[PDB]
Amino acid sequence: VSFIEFVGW
Amino acid sequence: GSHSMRYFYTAMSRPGRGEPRFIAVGYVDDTQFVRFDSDAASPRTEPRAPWIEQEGPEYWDGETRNMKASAQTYRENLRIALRYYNQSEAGSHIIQRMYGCDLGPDGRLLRGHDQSAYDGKDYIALNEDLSSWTAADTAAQITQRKWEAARVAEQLRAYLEGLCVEWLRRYLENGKETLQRADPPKTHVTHHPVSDHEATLRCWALGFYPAEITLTWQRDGEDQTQDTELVETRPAGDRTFQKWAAVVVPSGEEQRYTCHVQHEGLPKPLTLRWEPS
Amino acid sequence: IQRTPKIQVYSRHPAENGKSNFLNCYVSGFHPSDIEVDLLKNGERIEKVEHSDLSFSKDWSFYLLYYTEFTPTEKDEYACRVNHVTLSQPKIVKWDRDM
């Protein structure tokens, strides 16, 4: 199961 | 043996041809099990291995939603990268991401990974401590400062030590008949004259899984590393891999050469020679 | 900032004239990801060609497998034609049953 993004570059 | 799970993302901008394309693939060891492509007619996370098909609709709907969100994040990241490198909006650029977990033969977390690249060059990497970062340049240092302020490493650590390991173990159990089966190489040596006084000996390994393999030639028991042509391990299309190693040898000295094969599926390394018969 | 593709053209199983098989063209080591790959039979583009999903190696270079079902014969010539931004003209690699 994939990671949930929560921050950008 | 040891096992790993990895996700690979590629985000590719293309000014004048729509929003950046986002492609994600997931692997256990050398077996792909999911894909997502934002250019598909109906973008969805889709199965690519038989043992993942049993996951329920909640899995597929949730992974689709998550990959769509990740595509949006990486489109934003492409815009940010332009700012960080003083680049124009006219060029095409690529962000890549790889992350996941490695388990030892014991089954516990051996180590975690999370690395990103911009235009094919390292950008930022989570260190093995799962707590600090290595930035490749002064742009990535801006990202590093942002991620330190937001405590991003702590969330990655929680994912890599928790969900990543738990789901990898689930897949290894559900796919055990393939993921936990090593197929040894089928090996042989061919001989092809080059001239009246030289011939090529080619050592072949076919049909093996996983991809990791060592093929070496020795002359009089000494490795011939600098004189061996070694092709990249290549996929056969049936899950297995192929590789060969070749040396050019003086005619009449063929029996002084031995090929040595190491693979997880072999109880002991193989030694083979050219058999004129 | 760009890397040109390596190309291998080969069959899934050892070739035997008259026996169905798969022709593979494996392109790897390239960057950026846009690439055009055709499989050719006697110089003509084969229409039914599939490919793997885009992935990449630890050095960030991309790889793809293009493949099609085929039945080799003594006379038919097969090849892979690859175009990439790093190439000034398409590169054609012929299938050699011993490679």
PDB file of all heavy atoms in Angstrom, chain B residues 161-172:
ATOM      1  N   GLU B 161       8.326   1.652   8.704  1.00  0.00           N
ATOM      2  CA  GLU B 161       8.417   0.618   9.729  1.00  0.00           C
ATOM      3  C   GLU B 161       7.086  -0.073   9.983  1.00  0.00           C
ATOM      4  O   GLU B 161       7.066  -1.148  10.597  1.00  0.00           O
ATOM      5  CB  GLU B 161       8.909   1.221  11.051  1.00  0.00           C
ATOM      6  CG  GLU B 161      10.349   1.692  11.038  1.00  0.00           C
ATOM      7  CD  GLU B 161      10.814   2.154  12.407  1.00  0.00           C
ATOM      8  OE1 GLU B 161      10.045   2.856  13.094  1.00  0.00           O
ATOM      9  OE2 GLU B 161      11.942   1.800  12.805  1.00  0.00           O
ATOM     10  N   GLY B 162       5.978   0.530   9.560  1.00  0.00           N
ATOM     11  CA  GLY B 162       4.662  -0.005   9.851  1.00  0.00           C
ATOM     12  C   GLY B 162       3.970  -0.558   8.626  1.00  0.00           C
ATOM     13  O   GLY B 162       4.182  -1.715   8.262  1.00  0.00           O
ATOM     14  N   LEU B 163       3.166   0.284   7.968  1.00  0.00           N
ATOM     15  CA  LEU B 163       2.364  -0.156   6.828  1.00  0.00           C
ATOM     16  C   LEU B 163       3.209  -0.816   5.741  1.00  0.00           C
ATOM     17  O   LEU B 163       2.796  -1.819   5.156  1.00  0.00           O
ATOM     18  CB  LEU B 163       1.582   1.026   6.257  1.00  0.00           C
ATOM     19  CG  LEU B 163       0.368   1.471   7.070  1.00  0.00           C
ATOM     20  CD1 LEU B 163      -0.179   2.770   6.533  1.00  0.00           C
ATOM     21  CD2 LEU B 163      -0.702   0.390   7.037  1.00  0.00           C
ATOM     22  N   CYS B 164       4.380  -0.261   5.431  1.00  0.00           N
ATOM     23  CA  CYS B 164       5.190  -0.836   4.358  1.00  0.00           C
ATOM     24  C   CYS B 164       5.549  -2.283   4.676  1.00  0.00           C
ATOM     25  O   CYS B 164       5.340  -3.189   3.858  1.00  0.00           O
ATOM     26  CB  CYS B 164       6.450   0.007   4.141  1.00  0.00           C
ATOM     27  SG  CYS B 164       7.438  -0.469   2.686  1.00  0.00           S
ATOM     28  N   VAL B 165       6.053  -2.521   5.887  1.00  0.00           N
ATOM     29  CA  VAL B 165       6.438  -3.871   6.299  1.00  0.00           C
ATOM     30  C   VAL B 165       5.218  -4.781   6.386  1.00  0.00           C
ATOM     31  O   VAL B 165       5.257  -5.936   5.950  1.00  0.00           O
ATOM     32  CB  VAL B 165       7.208  -3.813   7.634  1.00  0.00           C
ATOM     33  CG1 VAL B 165       7.337  -5.200   8.249  1.00  0.00           C
ATOM     34  CG2 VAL B 165       8.574  -3.182   7.427  1.00  0.00           C
ATOM     35  N   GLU B 166       4.121  -4.282   6.960  1.00  0.00           N
ATOM     36  CA  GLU B 166       2.929  -5.108   7.140  1.00  0.00           C
ATOM     37  C   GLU B 166       2.361  -5.558   5.798  1.00  0.00           C
ATOM     38  O   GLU B 166       2.030  -6.739   5.602  1.00  0.00           O
ATOM     39  CB  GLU B 166       1.894  -4.320   7.944  1.00  0.00           C
ATOM     40  CG  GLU B 166       2.340  -4.002   9.364  1.00  0.00           C
ATOM     41  CD  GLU B 166       1.471  -2.947  10.025  1.00  0.00           C
ATOM     42  OE1 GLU B 166       0.414  -2.605   9.448  1.00  0.00           O
ATOM     43  OE2 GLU B 166       1.848  -2.454  11.112  1.00  0.00           O
ATOM     44  N   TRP B 167       2.256  -4.630   4.848  1.00  0.00           N
ATOM     45  CA  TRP B 167       1.717  -4.991   3.543  1.00  0.00           C
ATOM     46  C   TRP B 167       2.684  -5.873   2.760  1.00  0.00           C
ATOM     47  O   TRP B 167       2.252  -6.809   2.081  1.00  0.00           O
ATOM     48  CB  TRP B 167       1.308  -3.741   2.762  1.00  0.00           C
ATOM     49  CG  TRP B 167      -0.022  -3.244   3.205  1.00  0.00           C
ATOM     50  CD1 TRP B 167      -0.273  -2.300   4.159  1.00  0.00           C
ATOM     51  CD2 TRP B 167      -1.297  -3.681   2.726  1.00  0.00           C
ATOM     52  NE1 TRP B 167      -1.633  -2.121   4.300  1.00  0.00           N
ATOM     53  CE2 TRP B 167      -2.281  -2.958   3.431  1.00  0.00           C
ATOM     54  CE3 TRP B 167      -1.703  -4.620   1.771  1.00  0.00           C
ATOM     55  CZ2 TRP B 167      -3.643  -3.138   3.204  1.00  0.00           C
ATOM     56  CZ3 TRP B 167      -3.058  -4.793   1.544  1.00  0.00           C
ATOM     57  CH2 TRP B 167      -4.010  -4.055   2.258  1.00  0.00           C
ATOM     58  N   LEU B 168       3.990  -5.607   2.841  1.00  0.00           N
ATOM     59  CA  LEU B 168       4.944  -6.507   2.199  1.00  0.00           C
ATOM     60  C   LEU B 168       4.792  -7.931   2.724  1.00  0.00           C
ATOM     61  O   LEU B 168       4.779  -8.895   1.949  1.00  0.00           O
ATOM     62  CB  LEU B 168       6.375  -5.996   2.388  1.00  0.00           C
ATOM     63  CG  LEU B 168       7.488  -6.932   1.914  1.00  0.00           C
ATOM     64  CD1 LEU B 168       7.325  -7.344   0.449  1.00  0.00           C
ATOM     65  CD2 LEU B 168       8.852  -6.298   2.157  1.00  0.00           C
ATOM     66  N   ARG B 169       4.682  -8.090   4.047  1.00  0.00           N
ATOM     67  CA  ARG B 169       4.503  -9.430   4.595  1.00  0.00           C
ATOM     68  C   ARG B 169       3.214 -10.066   4.080  1.00  0.00           C
ATOM     69  O   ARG B 169       3.181 -11.265   3.754  1.00  0.00           O
ATOM     70  CB  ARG B 169       4.506  -9.361   6.119  1.00  0.00           C
ATOM     71  CG  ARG B 169       5.869  -9.063   6.704  1.00  0.00           C
ATOM     72  CD  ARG B 169       5.824  -9.027   8.223  1.00  0.00           C
ATOM     73  NE  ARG B 169       7.140  -8.729   8.777  1.00  0.00           N
ATOM     74  CZ  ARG B 169       7.345  -8.049   9.899  1.00  0.00           C
ATOM     75  NH1 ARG B 169       6.317  -7.577  10.594  1.00  0.00           N
ATOM     76  NH2 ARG B 169       8.580  -7.831  10.319  1.00  0.00           N
ATOM     77  N   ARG B 170       2.137  -9.276   3.988  1.00  0.00           N
ATOM     78  CA  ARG B 170       0.879  -9.808   3.462  1.00  0.00           C
ATOM     79  C   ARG B 170       1.045 -10.295   2.026  1.00  0.00           C
ATOM     80  O   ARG B 170       0.590 -11.392   1.672  1.00  0.00           O
ATOM     81  CB  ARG B 170      -0.207  -8.738   3.542  1.00  0.00           C
ATOM     82  CG  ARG B 170      -1.517  -9.136   2.895  1.00  0.00           C
ATOM     83  CD  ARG B 170      -2.459  -7.951   2.870  1.00  0.00           C
ATOM     84  NE  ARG B 170      -3.679  -8.210   2.108  1.00  0.00           N
ATOM     85  CZ  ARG B 170      -4.900  -8.131   2.619  1.00  0.00           C
ATOM     86  NH1 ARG B 170      -5.056  -7.795   3.893  1.00  0.00           N
ATOM     87  NH2 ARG B 170      -5.961  -8.381   1.864  1.00  0.00           N
ATOM     88  N   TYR B 171       1.691  -9.485   1.182  1.00  0.00           N
ATOM     89  CA  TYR B 171       1.902  -9.875  -0.213  1.00  0.00           C
ATOM     90  C   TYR B 171       2.765 -11.126  -0.307  1.00  0.00           C
ATOM     91  O   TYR B 171       2.500 -12.014  -1.125  1.00  0.00           O
ATOM     92  CB  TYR B 171       2.574  -8.743  -0.986  1.00  0.00           C
ATOM     93  CG  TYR B 171       1.804  -7.440  -1.037  1.00  0.00           C
ATOM     94  CD1 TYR B 171       2.477  -6.228  -1.132  1.00  0.00           C
ATOM     95  CD2 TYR B 171       0.417  -7.417  -1.019  1.00  0.00           C
ATOM     96  CE1 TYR B 171       1.797  -5.026  -1.184  1.00  0.00           C
ATOM     97  CE2 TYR B 171      -0.277  -6.216  -1.077  1.00  0.00           C
ATOM     98  CZ  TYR B 171       0.414  -5.027  -1.156  1.00  0.00           C
ATOM     99  OH  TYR B 171      -0.258  -3.822  -1.206  1.00  0.00           O
ATOM    100  N   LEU B 172       3.818 -11.207   0.508  1.00  0.00           N
ATOM    101  CA  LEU B 172       4.695 -12.372   0.460  1.00  0.00           C
ATOM    102  C   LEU B 172       3.938 -13.639   0.823  1.00  0.00           C
ATOM    103  O   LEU B 172       4.195 -14.705   0.256  1.00  0.00           O
ATOM    104  CB  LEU B 172       5.878 -12.178   1.407  1.00  0.00           C
ATOM    105  CG  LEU B 172       6.923 -11.148   0.968  1.00  0.00           C
ATOM    106  CD1 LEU B 172       7.855 -10.823   2.133  1.00  0.00           C
ATOM    107  CD2 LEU B 172       7.720 -11.654  -0.236  1.00  0.00           C
TER     108      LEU B 172
END
